[PDB]
Amino acid sequence: TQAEIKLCSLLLQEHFGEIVEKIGVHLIRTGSQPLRVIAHDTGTSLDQVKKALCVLVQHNLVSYQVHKRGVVEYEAQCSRVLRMLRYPRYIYTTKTLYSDTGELIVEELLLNGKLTMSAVVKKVADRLTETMEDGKTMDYAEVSNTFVRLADTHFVQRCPSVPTTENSDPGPPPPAPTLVINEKDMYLVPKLSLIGKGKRRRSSPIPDDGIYWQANLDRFHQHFRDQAIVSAVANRMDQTSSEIVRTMLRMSEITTSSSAPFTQPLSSNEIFRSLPVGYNISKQVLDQYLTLLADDPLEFVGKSGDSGGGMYVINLHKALASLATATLESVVQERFGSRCARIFRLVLQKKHIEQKQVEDFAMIPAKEAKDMLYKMLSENFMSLQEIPKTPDHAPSRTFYLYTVNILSAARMLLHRCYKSIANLIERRQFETKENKRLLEKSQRVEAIIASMQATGAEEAQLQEIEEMITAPERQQLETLKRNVNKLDASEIQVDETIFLLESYIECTMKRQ
Amino acid sequence: LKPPPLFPDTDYKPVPLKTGEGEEYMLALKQELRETMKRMPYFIETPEERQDIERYSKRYMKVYKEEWIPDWRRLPREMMPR
Amino acid sequence: MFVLVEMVDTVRIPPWQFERKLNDSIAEELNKKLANKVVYNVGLCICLFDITKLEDAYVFPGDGASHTKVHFRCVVFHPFLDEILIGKIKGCSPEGVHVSLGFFDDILIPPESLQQPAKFDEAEQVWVWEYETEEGAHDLYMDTGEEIRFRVVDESFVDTSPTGPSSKEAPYTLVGSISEPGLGLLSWW
Amino acid sequence: RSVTGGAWYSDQDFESEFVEVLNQQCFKFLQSKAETARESKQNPMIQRNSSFASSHEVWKYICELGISKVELSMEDIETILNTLIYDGKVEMTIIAAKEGTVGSVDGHMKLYRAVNPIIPPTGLVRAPCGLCPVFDDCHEGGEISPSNCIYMTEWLEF
Amino acid sequence: KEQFRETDVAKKISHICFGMKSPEEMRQQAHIQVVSKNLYSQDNQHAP
Numbered sequence: 001t002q003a004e005i006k007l008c009s010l011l012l013q014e015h016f017g018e019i020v021e022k023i024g025v026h027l028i029r030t031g032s033q034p035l036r037v038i039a040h041d042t043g044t045s046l047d048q049v050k051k052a053l054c055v056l057v058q059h060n061l062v063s064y065q066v067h068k069r070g071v072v073e074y075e076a077q078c079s080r081v082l083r084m085l086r087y088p089r090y091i092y093t094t095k096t097l098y099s100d101t102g103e104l105i106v107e108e109l110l111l112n113g114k115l116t117m118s119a120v121v122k123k124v125a126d127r128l129t130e131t132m133e134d135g136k137t138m139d140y141a142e143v144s145n146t147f148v149r150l151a152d153t154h155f156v157q158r159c160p161s162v163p164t165t166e167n168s169d170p171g172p173p174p175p176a177p178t179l180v181i182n183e184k185d186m187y188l189v190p191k192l193s194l195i196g197k198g199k200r201r202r203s204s205p206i207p208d209d210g211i212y213w214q215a216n217l218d219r220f221h222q223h224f225r226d227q228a229i230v231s232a233v234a235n236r237m238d239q240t241s242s243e244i245v246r247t248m249l250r251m252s253e254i255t256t257s258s259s260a261p262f263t264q265p266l267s268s269n270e271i272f273r274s275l276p277v278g279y280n281i282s283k284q285v286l287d288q289y290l291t292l293l294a295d296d297p298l299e300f301v302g303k304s305g306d307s308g309g310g311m312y313v314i315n316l317h318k319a320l321a322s323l324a325t326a327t328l329e330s331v332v333q334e335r336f337g338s339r340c341a342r343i344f345r346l347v348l349q350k351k352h353i354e355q356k357q358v359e360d361f362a363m364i365p366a367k368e369a370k371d372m373l374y375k376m377l378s379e380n381f382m383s384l385q386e387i388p389k390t391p392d393h394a395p396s397r398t399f400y401l402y403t404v405n406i407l408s409a410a411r412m413l414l415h416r417c418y419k420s421i422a423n424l425i426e427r428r429q430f431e432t433k434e435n436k437r438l439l440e441k442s443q444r445v446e447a448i449i450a451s452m453q454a455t456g457a458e459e460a461q462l463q464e465i466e467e468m469i470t471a472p473e474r475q476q477l478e479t480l481k482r483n484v485n486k487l488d489a490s491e492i493q494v495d496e497t498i499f500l501l502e503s504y505i506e507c508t509m510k511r512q
Numbered sequence: 513l514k515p516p517p518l519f520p521d522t523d524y525k526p527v528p529l530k531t532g533e534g535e536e537y538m539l540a541l542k543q544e545l546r547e548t549m550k551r552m553p554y555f556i557e558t559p560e561e562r563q564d565i566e567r568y569s570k571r572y573m574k575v576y577k578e579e580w581i582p583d584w585r586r587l588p589r590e591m592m593p594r
Numbered sequence: 595m596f597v598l599v600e601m602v603d604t605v606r607i608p609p610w611q612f613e614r615k616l617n618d619s620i621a622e623e624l625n626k627k628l629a630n631k632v633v634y635n636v637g638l639c640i641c642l643f644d645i646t647k648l649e650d651a652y653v654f655p656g657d658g659a660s661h662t663k664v665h666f667r668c669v670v671f672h673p674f675l676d677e678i679l680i681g682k683i684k685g686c687s688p689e690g691v692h693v694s695l696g697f698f699d700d701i702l703i704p705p706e707s708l709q710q711p712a713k714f715d716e717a718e719q720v721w722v723w724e725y726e727t728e729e730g731a732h733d734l735y736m737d738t739g740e741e742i743r744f745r746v747v748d749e750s751f752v753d754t755s756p757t758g759p760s761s762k763e764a765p766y767t768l769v770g771s772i773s774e775p776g777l778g779l780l781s782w783w
Numbered sequence: 784r785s786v787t788g789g790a791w792y793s794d795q796d797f798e799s800e801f802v803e804v805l806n807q808q809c810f811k812f813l814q815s816k817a818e819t820a821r822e823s824k825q826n827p828m829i830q831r832n833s834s835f836a837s838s839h840e841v842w843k844y845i846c847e848l849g850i851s852k853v854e855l856s857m858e859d860i861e862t863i864l865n866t867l868i869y870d871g872k873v874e875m876t877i878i879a880a881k882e883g884t885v886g887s888v889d890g891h892m893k894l895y896r897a898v899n900p901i902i903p904p905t906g907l908v909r910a911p912c913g914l915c916p917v918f919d920d921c922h923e924g925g926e927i928s929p930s931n932c933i934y935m936t937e938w939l940e941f
Numbered sequence: 942k943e944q945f946r947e948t949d950v951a952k953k954i955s956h957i958c959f960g961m962k963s964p965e966e967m968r969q970q971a972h973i974q975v976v977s978k979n980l981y982s983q984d985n986q987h988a989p
């Protein structure tokens with residue numbers, strides 16, 4: 001997992017800096033360890049180690065556990081180190097589903113790691129002062145309404161609570177507080193009525209103490225999976241079918257398990273009554289779509305019963321498999337053309353086959369199929385089974401049967417993507433560090449121009465500062481800017497593939 | 513005789529990138545974030561060190577900040593910043 | 595300007611020196627070894643200051659020269675930024691005026707540091723001067739001149755270590771400022 | 784299999800240009816018929832029925848315009864249509880030979896009628912690294928590095 | 942005047958670490974790649 005290790009490293013550098021990156025990489029390379037050995041191996045001052053570890057545990061990047069003989073073991077979760085890349089995605093979806101107040105709520109919750117109700121609502125109200133002017137005021141009522149709506153919709157989840165000292169282990173406290181998570185109060189928001197008008201940057205006790213909250217990444221991922229499924233169906237059959245899929249996913253979510261291959265049983269009568277009234281559809285029309293969807297050769301949904309006449313269940317894992325297939329065939333077709341995507345999907349359907357059958361079945365011309373078959377064999381996109389003609393398995397006594405392996409595929413495509421995000425960050429940083437000299441040379445003069453502007457200084461500075469050499473370099477600065485922009489957009493997009501890959505490798509993994 | 517260029521010619525070239533108001537908004541949000549996590553105590557930069565000489569100016573531009581302290585009930589009683 | 599820095603090193607003494615008391619021998623050796631050369635990090639070494647501590651003198655096999663380790667301190671030339679200083683001129687240039695400190699000469703006074711009114715000469719490399727009421731563009735700085743007053747504003751070390759398999763500028767640089775009143779030729783003040 | 788090779792073998796190549804242009808012609812025409820179906824959105828049972836581009840009628844379309852003067856009757860056309868059914872141009876809708884014209888002949892409507900995919904090119908292939916041949920051979924530390932990768936350079940240069 | 946470098950590099954062995962070499966590092970060490978099968982030039986100079 002060296003590529004992943006590097007991704008962790010560069011994310012820590014980007015987001016936290018040097019010492020934090022050092023401690024993080026060391027911990028993910030060493031696993032659970034007590035403080036003293038970590039400080040010894042690193043060799044740095046224990047104050048820096050302590051400070052790093054508390055900032056990481058504040059954002060839940062690391063955890064601490066009481067261990068045998070009373071020592072405290074400290075461990076870091078590698079997966080959580082790959083979530084800040086999706087913070088724009090979380091912010092966008094909450095902005096789509098909630099007003100900018102919810103966007104700011106999620107922003108504060110993420111960037112602070114954890115927050116309490118009073119702290120988060122007060123901070124959001126205070127920061128929103130930059131958004132409203134001309135005497136407009138902000139009261140915690142609407143902020144609290146948006147947060148409780150978020151929590152009810154499962155997007156915001158409560159942090160584990162500390163145990164009660166007077167109720168457990170009286171006397172000298174243990175080395176670590178050993179926090180305990182409670183599920184019945186998971187989305188049970190604390191109650192408050194305080195309101196405070198935001199201070200508009202004029203430059204002139206907690207009722208919910210200990211009730212910390214954090215963003216529900218699982219809910220975000222589930223929402224992303226729903227969006228992907230809805231999009232898949234939209235391209236597949238029709239917008240009406242897509243809206244039906246958007247619908248039965250909605251009642252599915254409120255009751256289905258995130259890991260189950262199949263949703264809870266859903267009838268057409270409940271779909272119709274919960275179906276939006278803005279579409280001119282009857283119950284019989286809905287039944288027709290559901291019956292013809294269940295008859296889909298891709299088996300996207302299955303009947304699975306007959307209660308209420310219309311009875312259907314979506315196959316999440318099978319849909320994810322189709323998603324994983326489509327993305328893999330996407331890469332193949334741009335890397336090798338339609339014919340390569342043709343030869344493979346032939347092999348996907350024909351589980352076992354050899355060159356002559358492939359050529360016959362696709363008229364891939366002689367001296368073309370074989371060479372291409374050798375090439376994408378070299379890419380590990382195809383596995384050779386090689387049955388014997390004799391128990392020696394000699395090359396003259398074997399048949400070269402071809403065989404697919406989707407799971408291994410999804411894995412080392414994902415590794416490809418991991419190396420992808422890394423070497424982009426390498427170039428973005430390489431460009432940033434090479435241009436830093438001109439950047440600071442332009443920023444200092446820009447600050448000079450921007451400074452003492454409201455003071456009423458004379459206008460003989462705008463033109464007199466621009467005669468410098470950076471003026472015929474602004475186009476190069478914009479060249480760098482669009483280059484970083486163009487890099488970033490691809491990074492954003494790559495994260496969109498990553499979701500499909502990670503979702504399928506997760507679902508196919510049984511976790512036993 | 514001669515090993516090739518380090519950079520062989522390839523017929524297939526990277527698929528063109530997307531653009532749109534949503535993508536631009538996400539890029540702006542990404543720029544905002546990369547500008548944001550530099551401005552709070554969680555961004556633990558290296559402490560200031562190795563003063564050169566006893567300059568008089570130090571009385572004014574000294575950086576002052578609060579000793580950040582989380583909810584200590586939630587952490588072991590072993591890393592007090594004092 | 596002068597800085598005293600702590601130093602440790604190991605030295606070899608050939609046998610014919612055994613007649614002398616060891617401290618003076620090690621002192622003169624350390625001086626010849628250090629004196630009149632510059633360090634990439636702390637500036638120009640002048641001469642040893644004092645020898646503080648001495649270890650035991652070993653006699654390694656395969657040689658007859660006693661080896662020993664010293665703790666000592668030395669005086670180094672290392673002016674700090676914004677330091678005032680007086681030094682002779684050594685030559686004019688389009689990029690500024692070169693100033694000599696007698697034992698050191700890599701000081702430049704660029705035209706940005708020079709007074710605004712005078713920006714170039716009458717094609718003669720001798721830098722000229724210009725003011726408002728008096729000094730009608732007739733005063734000029736002699737390549738030798740007096741020990742003009744100036745304040746350093748920049749300094750840099752440049753490494754000149756060998757590169758590649760085996761088989762000219764000074765490695766230590768400074769920049770001065772002369773714009774402010776009272777700076778430059780004392781005849782003006 | 785020799786001189787025969789399927790009668791498309793002509794010129795001893797499977798006549799690659801003619802087989803690919805014949806496949807493209809077949810695809811486009813049956814798109815046109817399935818497009819009549821989709822434009823009409825005929826009471827969807829009949830929409831999908833007209834989207835069963837009858838491949839007996841495809842076979843009678845491909846004998847004409849002087850395309851398949853070479854051996855055409857089922858076997859050869861049906862198998863070239865099958866070479867198009869191999870790949871993602873198509874998905875399972877033959878309903879055996881009995882439902883449809885000999886099963887719309889190997890199901891030469893199946894889901895050619897609607898090859899419509901469900902996703903745009905992966906952000907990876909959009910990026911240089913994605914297509915960059917020396918992708919894993921871009922050992923930054925070594926010669927090939929993102930900070931010089933001519934592909935990255937070019938991709939970003941434009 | 943010139944910047945000072947140490948004049949002696951005398952040192953003694955203390956330990957030997959065994960291991961293998963990674964291919965990118967193996968290429969970094971190597972001066973060049975050999976690519977021609979044959980040994981000497983066709984001409985009567987017997988040059989490599």
Ligand code: SF4
Nearest residue numbers: 912915918921929932
């Ligand atoms: S060579 Fe450059 S563009 Fe290609 S994969 Fe490596 S880093 Fe990416």
